[PDB]
Amino acid sequence: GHSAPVHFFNTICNGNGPTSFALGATYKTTKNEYIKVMDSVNDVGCQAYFQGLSNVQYIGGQLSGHGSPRNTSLATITQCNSFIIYGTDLEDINGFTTDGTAITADNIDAIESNYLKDISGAAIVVSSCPGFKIDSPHIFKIKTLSTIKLMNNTYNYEIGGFTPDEALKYNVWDANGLATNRISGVIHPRLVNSRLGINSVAFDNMSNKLDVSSLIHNETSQIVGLTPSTGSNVPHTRKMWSNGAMYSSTDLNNGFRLNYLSNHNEPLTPMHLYNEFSVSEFGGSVTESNALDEIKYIFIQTTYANSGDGRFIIQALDASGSVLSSNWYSPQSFNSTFPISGFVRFDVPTGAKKIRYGFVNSANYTGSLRSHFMSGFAYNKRFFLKIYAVYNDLGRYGQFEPPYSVAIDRFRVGDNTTQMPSIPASSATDVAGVNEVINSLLASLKANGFMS
Amino acid sequence: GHSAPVHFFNTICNGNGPTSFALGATYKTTKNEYIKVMDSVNDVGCQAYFQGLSNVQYIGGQLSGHGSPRNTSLATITQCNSFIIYGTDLEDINGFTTDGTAITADNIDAIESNYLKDISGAAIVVSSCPGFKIDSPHIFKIKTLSTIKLMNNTYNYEIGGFTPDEALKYNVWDANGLATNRISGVIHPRLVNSRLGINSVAFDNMSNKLDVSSLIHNETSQIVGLTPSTGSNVPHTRKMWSNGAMYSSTDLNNGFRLNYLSNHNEPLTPMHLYNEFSVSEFGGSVTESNALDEIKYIFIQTTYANSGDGRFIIQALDASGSVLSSNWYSPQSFNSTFPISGFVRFDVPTGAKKIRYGFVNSANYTGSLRSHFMSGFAYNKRFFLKIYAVYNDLGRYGQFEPPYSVAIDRFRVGDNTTQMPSIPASSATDVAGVNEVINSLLASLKANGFMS
Numbered sequence: 001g002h003s004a005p006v007h008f009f010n011t012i013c014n015g016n017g018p019t020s021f022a023l024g025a026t027y028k029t030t031k032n033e034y035i036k037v038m039d040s041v042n043d044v045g046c047q048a049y050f051q052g053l054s055n056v057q058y059i060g061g062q063l064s065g066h067g068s069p070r071n072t073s074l075a076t077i078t079q080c081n082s083f084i085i086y087g088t089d090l091e092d093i094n095g096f097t098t099d100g101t102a103i104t105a106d107n108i109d110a111i112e113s114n115y116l117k118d119i120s121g122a123a124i125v126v127s128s129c130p131g132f133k134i135d136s137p138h139i140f141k142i143k144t145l146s147t148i149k150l151m152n153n154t155y156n157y158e159i160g161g162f163t164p165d166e167a168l169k170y171n172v173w174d175a176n177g178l179a180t181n182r183i184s185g186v187i188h189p190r191l192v193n194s195r196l197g198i199n200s201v202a203f204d205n206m207s208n209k210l211d212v213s214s215l216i217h218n219e220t221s222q223i224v225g226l227t228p229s230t231g232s233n234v235p236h237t238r239k240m241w242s243n244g245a246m247y248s249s250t251d252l253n254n255g256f257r258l259n260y261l262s263n264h265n266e267p268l269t270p271m272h273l274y275n276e277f278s279v280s281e282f283g284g285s286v287t288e289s290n291a292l293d294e295i296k297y298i299f300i301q302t303t304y305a306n307s308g309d310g311r312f313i314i315q316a317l318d319a320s321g322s323v324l325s326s327n328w329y330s331p332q333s334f335n336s337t338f339p340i341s342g343f344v345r346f347d348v349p350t351g352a353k354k355i356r357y358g359f360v361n362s363a364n365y366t367g368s369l370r371s372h373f374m375s376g377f378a379y380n381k382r383f384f385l386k387i388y389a390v391y392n393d394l395g396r397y398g399q400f401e402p403p404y405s406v407a408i409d410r411f412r413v414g415d416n417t418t419q420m421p422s423i424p425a426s427s428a429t430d431v432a433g434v435n436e437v438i439n440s441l442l443a444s445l446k447a448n449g450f451m452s
Numbered sequence: 453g454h455s456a457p458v459h460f461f462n463t464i465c466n467g468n469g470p471t472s473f474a475l476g477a478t479y480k481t482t483k484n485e486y487i488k489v490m491d492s493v494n495d496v497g498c499q500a501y502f503q504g505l506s507n508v509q510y511i512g513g514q515l516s517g518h519g520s521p522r523n524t525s526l527a528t529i530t531q532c533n534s535f536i537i538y539g540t541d542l543e544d545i546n547g548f549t550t551d552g553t554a555i556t557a558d559n560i561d562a563i564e565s566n567y568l569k570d571i572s573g574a575a576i577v578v579s580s581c582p583g584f585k586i587d588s589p590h591i592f593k594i595k596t597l598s599t600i601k602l603m604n605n606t607y608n609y610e611i612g613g614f615t616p617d618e619a620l621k622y623n624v625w626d627a628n629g630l631a632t633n634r635i636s637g638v639i640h641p642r643l644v645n646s647r648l649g650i651n652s653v654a655f656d657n658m659s660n661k662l663d664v665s666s667l668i669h670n671e672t673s674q675i676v677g678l679t680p681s682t683g684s685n686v687p688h689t690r691k692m693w694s695n696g697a698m699y700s701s702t703d704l705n706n707g708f709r710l711n712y713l714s715n716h717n718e719p720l721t722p723m724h725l726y727n728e729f730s731v732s733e734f735g736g737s738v739t740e741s742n743a744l745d746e747i748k749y750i751f752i753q754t755t756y757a758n759s760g761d762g763r764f765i766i767q768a769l770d771a772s773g774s775v776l777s778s779n780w781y782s783p784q785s786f787n788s789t790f791p792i793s794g795f796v797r798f799d800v801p802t803g804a805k806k807i808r809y810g811f812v813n814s815a816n817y818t819g820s821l822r823s824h825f826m827s828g829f830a831y832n833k834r835f836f837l838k839i840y841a842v843y844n845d846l847g848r849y850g851q852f853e854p855p856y857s858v859a860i861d862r863f864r865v866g867d868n869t870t871q872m873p874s875i876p877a878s879s880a881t882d883v884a885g886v887n888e889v890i891n892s893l894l895a896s897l898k899a900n901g902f903m904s
Contacts, residue, residue: 010459060459060509087536089457089507136583136610138456138507138534161583161608161638162534189659190608190636211659212636222865237868277675282792285758285830290631290791393634394659395753396789398672398836404854405692406668407727414855414863433880437890441875449869450902 017069042100244273255369274358469497494552588612696725707821726810
């Protein structure tokens with residue numbers, strides 16, 4: 001049941017929440033009776049609460065908590081339709097949870113894990129409101145986890161360019177999770193490459209993600225597998241990696257070889273499957289305060305599997321090869337989409353010169369990509385790996401993309417080379433000795449893909 | 453200090469700045485005393501001036517100069533926060549500068565070069581206002597250099613689809629320049645492919661630039677250099693170019709070979725490094741009024757350098773091969789992001805059939821890319837070249853992108869060919885003569901990159 005349409009013009013809600021004084025206060029009536037103002041010691045409030053509405057326009061008002069009242073949010077929108085905000089002043093929130101837990105930068109990590117499905121933790125919490133829009137307000141003094149929280153099937157939201165870095169952890173906190181739900185929202189690019197960015201779920205549902213990032217690694221499985229294989233669910237050639245090897249040569253359907261690594265801050269050896277590339281390369285006549293960093297965030301998308309022991313490692317190195325930062329990622333960590341695949345976020349620290357990424361084994365044995373990362377193809381039969389690089393500035397150092405030229409036929413249409421038909425061995429009865437180099441050259445051609 | 457939030461509704465500011473009559477006017481007081489109205493002969497004004505505000509909404513008003521008053525702009529926003537415009541009528545501006553210089557179509561080039569940092573030259577001038585929104589209003593009769601001007605760290609702006617071609621030079625004039633600033637704005641795509649487009653700085657900061665354009669040339673330096681190299685800071689091969697050569701076959705790190713050319717309208721020879729491709733290919737049963745042009749603008753991004761005689765040349769040719777238009781681009785011209793790289797804009801004239809682009813030398817000697825275009829790798833240690841083609845219509849002729857097919861393994865995962873191990877020379881003592889054709893094929897395989 002609902003009412004539509006509700007119109008709000010230049011309306012201000014200020015200071016509306018349980019405060020320190022109100023919780024301990026007792027109202028004395030004219031009949032000399034005392035009434036306890038609080039319902040409980042964990043009483044929490046809000047400035048504006050909306051539920052069961054449609055076509056609500058809040059045009060140029062103000063939502064702020066002055067006097068530090070215990071608020072779970074400034075505006076709570078639940079089960080509404082087409083809630084649009086037009087330049088509302090938002091400021092001075094006192095972050096709390098629904099059960100009365102104070103949101104503080106000290107315990108900001110336990111709030112995201114234990115209170116993900118809670119209706120709290122942002123200046124504006126949107127729950128089950130399809131047509132949401134915020135339209136670039138000015139926000140400041142936000143003492144909670146994020147600025148906007150989206151959850152419970154908010155699938156067509158649009159978020160404008162408000163003040164990026166005001167909350168404690170994020171700017172946009174997408175908490176939508178359900179396999180049946182298809183979320184596709186629009187986020188301003190300036191909110192992604194800021195000091196506080198968006199979480200991995202918000203980047204999963206960001207439709208204009210190529211406006212701020214680009215793919216630095218794109219690998220998928222082939223259609224027809226090679227000769228020594230019993231399937232075509234993983235790569236069989238290793239041609240996309242600089243170090244490492246394959247798990248098996250008699251069954252290529254087993255993926256890459258996962259070698260043991262004790263922790264993510266340990267050095268990678270040539271036996272591990274990993275790549276390496278440099279960033280932020282500027283000359284000697286440039287000051288490091290003028291030349292900023294290249295990459296701000298790195299988003300990795302991979303297949304999802306319930307069990308693990310196979311880790312996707314990523315490291316940020318500097319000059320002299322010292323590890324500045326690292327992180328593990330188990331197969332069950334990619335659950336933006338629980339059934340198929342998910343996203344993870346990695347923060348590139350300032351001063352990093354090189355980036356390493358690959359697959360390792362967290363247990364003390366040698367595993368394979370199929371059995372120890374994909375769980376034997378139980379949740380997905382097509383492996384893929386996508387790594388997005390969110391640049392600090394749009395195109396300062398040049399975005400990384402595959403080479404192409406409209407005037408060169410090798411890149412415009414591709415090269416005109418085909419696999420040669422199989423040539424039999426040289427067994428002429430006219431001379432020996434030369435059959436040494438001929439059959440070896442014919443064998444090298446067949447072994448390197450040039451010949452069938 | 454500031455006031456927030458200021459609300460404007462259906463408010464009109466009409467014909468306010470100093471006029472011809474007012475400048476020469478003298479007020480006669482009741483006490484028979486005379487007061488000169490004009491402070492100086494170069495008095496200038498605007499309809500609305502805003503400074504030090506936050507969360508300002510101008511909802512459906514009108515800003516117009518009637519009676520031709522001397523105005524630097526219609527609205528001047530300076531050091532504000534979240535200024536949003538909602539469908540405001542804007543019209544009839546008389547372009548002037550802050551010092552009283554009239555902005556006409558004759559001096560439109562000297563004003564852009566000499567008054568870049570001036571707070572003037574547009575219908576709406578935005579200076580140091582992060583959250584600016586324009587919401588696409590209807591605009592006409594604009595006698596300034598541009599319609600919107602952005603400068604002084606306006607880093608997150610959205611510009612809607614207003615009337616494109618009303619100003620004299622541009623639609624959006626981005627004047628943001630600073631090494632520490634990170635600008636990321638959103639511009640409506642219909643404002644980029646218009647008669648008047650956006651300047652090179654606005655395309656630099658345009659995050660949704662792939663919605664209106666596509667890369668027709670993308671080239672970067674490799675990681676590991678070739679054998680005679682002394683470093684890997686430039687392309688060591690010439691596979692991206694159809695003409696020209698390398699500077700020296702003994703170093704390969706000096707880059708391409710820059711040959712002398714008198715002017716940009718001179719014909720390019722096979723000794724020059726340049727490419728060529730055709731545009732607007734329609735059949736005989738199509739009328740040229742129905743078949744429009746293919747490319748509207750071309751944006752080139754390259755590394756910055758403070759000196760050098762090497763020039764990036766681009767030419768627009770026709771049938772019979774006559775040069776319609778051309779332009780030089782020195783290394784200092786790529787300074788839209790001063791310390792690293794920059795953008796330039798080239799206007800493709802109507803009737804053009806072919807486009808040529810490459811690198812030449814403006815001085816009468818043969819130079820190299822490392823020394824005569826870059827300053828010895830003093831600013832950027834990685835060379836890149838990205839050329840964007842802004843199409844007249846979105847996909848009329850088909851956008852140029854690398855070939856791909858999801859059903860072909862050669863394009864889905866790549867070809868399964870590797871460099872063969874080095875095969876020694878055939879020196880068998882059993883027969884000669886054939887060893888000539890054997891070692892010549894083995895030498896060619898090693899020379900063509902097929903063999904190590």
